[PDB]
């Protein structure tokens, strides 16, 4: 409808909106969430089974049950059948970003500055900003992750390295 869309757009978060934009970048930006949803409804497929998966990707089960009147079972079944909307590459990127504090991103922007300009990265940026900047530099892709893995190993986060290895083994 429209009231549900208004509640959805008003009950989200700025960082949550940033994560949503980062995730939707894969499909291929609208600064506002409402324009992005209009685009998804018009050109893409704004299906319930897709929006539910998108919200479940960011751990917002409260809005999932409150608005959709559906539990985690429907999105679980949808994921078990096929993750049509998003890619596991974006999911892993978001999950990795979710597990980093201010010191981690500070060390990352310090270390990756070796072959990136100071003004190119600027400051006050999240891990999604680093990811999109690397994508613009065109050396990070769902198949090439050795440089990222090495950089992660440098800052002594080996559990995330194991997660990267597990993801690479899966696909």
């Amino acid at each position: 409808s429209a009231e549900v869309i208004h509640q959805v757009e008003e009950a989200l978060d700025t960082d949550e909106k940033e994560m949503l934009l980062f995730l939707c970048r894969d499909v291929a930006v609208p600064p506002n969430v409402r324009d992005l949803l209009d685009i998804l409804r018009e050109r893409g497929k704004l299906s319930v089974g897709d929006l539910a998966e998108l919200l479940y990707r960011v751990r917002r089960f409260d809005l999932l049950k409150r608005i959709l009147k559906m539990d985690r079972k429907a999105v679980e079944t949808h994921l078990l059948r096929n993750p049509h909307l998003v890619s596991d590459y974006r999911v892993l990127m978001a999950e990795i970003g979710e597990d980093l504090d201010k010191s981690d991103v500070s060390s990352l922007i310090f270390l990756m500055k070796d072959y990136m300009g100071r003004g190119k990265i600027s400051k006050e940026k999240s891990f999604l900003d680093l990811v999109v900047e690397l994508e613009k530099l065109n050396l990070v892709a769902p198949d090439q992750l050795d440089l990222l893995e090495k950089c992660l190993k440098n800052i002594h986060r080996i559990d995330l390295k194991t997660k990267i290895q597990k993801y690479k083994q899966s696909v």
């Binding site: 751990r59 917002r60 089960f61 409260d62 049950k65 970003g97 979710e98 597990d99 980093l100 504090d101 201010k102 002594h156 986060r157 080996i158 559990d159 194991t162």
Partner: protein, 182 residues
């Protein structure tokens, strides 16, 4: 809005250390990014509500959390639950929403004094950089750092056992009990 008032009353009876312990015990359902700016019980409760683990009809997670930190008076005054009921509920398999691994770690953490903490820090000088061995660090900080560098986990325990053997042996008893439970 009595539910919010009850939650506020519960949160108003927590100091800094209890808040830190609660934050540590929630690492299995809260990411570090969502946890960095947390400085009050209300923020943590809002975070839990966002994942719909806490509501008027669902109080089990809060009961387990408060039980694990032994703050029984808060349990009995507001939640109207006694020790026997919680013990029976946790005895039932399938009702455990928190891994016994983290619980064992926290219980071990409660059994260290300042001199024992200094001895532990001195013992782990070899395998850990002094930067992570700051004098301001507590046991939980060391545990979080060790888990971060995957030098200590569910299956990685031998270094932990060897280091803890020097200070005491009942710690080995607790570790063996947890291992047998698995």
């Amino acid at each position: 809005m009595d539910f919010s008032r009850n939650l506020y009353d519960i949160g108003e009876q927590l100091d800094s250390e209890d808040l830190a312990s609660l934050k540590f015990l929630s690492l299995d359902y809260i990411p570090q990014r969502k946890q960095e700016p947390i400085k009050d019980a209300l923020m943590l409760f809002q975070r839990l509500q966002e994942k719909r683990m806490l509501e008027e009809s669902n109080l089990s997670f809060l009961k387990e959390l408060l039980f694990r930190i032994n703050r029984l008076d808060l349990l009995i005054t507001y939640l109207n639950t006694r020790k026997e009921e919680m013990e029976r509920e946790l005895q039932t398999p399938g009702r455990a929403q928190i891994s016994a691994y983290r619980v064992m770690l926290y219980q071990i953490s409660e059994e260290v004094s300042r001199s024992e903490l200094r001895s532990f820090k001195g013992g782990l000088q070899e395998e850990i950089s002094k930067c992570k061995l700051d004098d301001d660090m507590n046991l939980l900080d060391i545990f979080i750092e060790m888990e971060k560098r995957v030098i200590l986990g569910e299956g990685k325990l031998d270094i932990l056992k060897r280091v803890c053997a020097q200070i005491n042996k009942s710690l080995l008893k607790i570790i063996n009990d947890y291992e047998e439970f698995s």
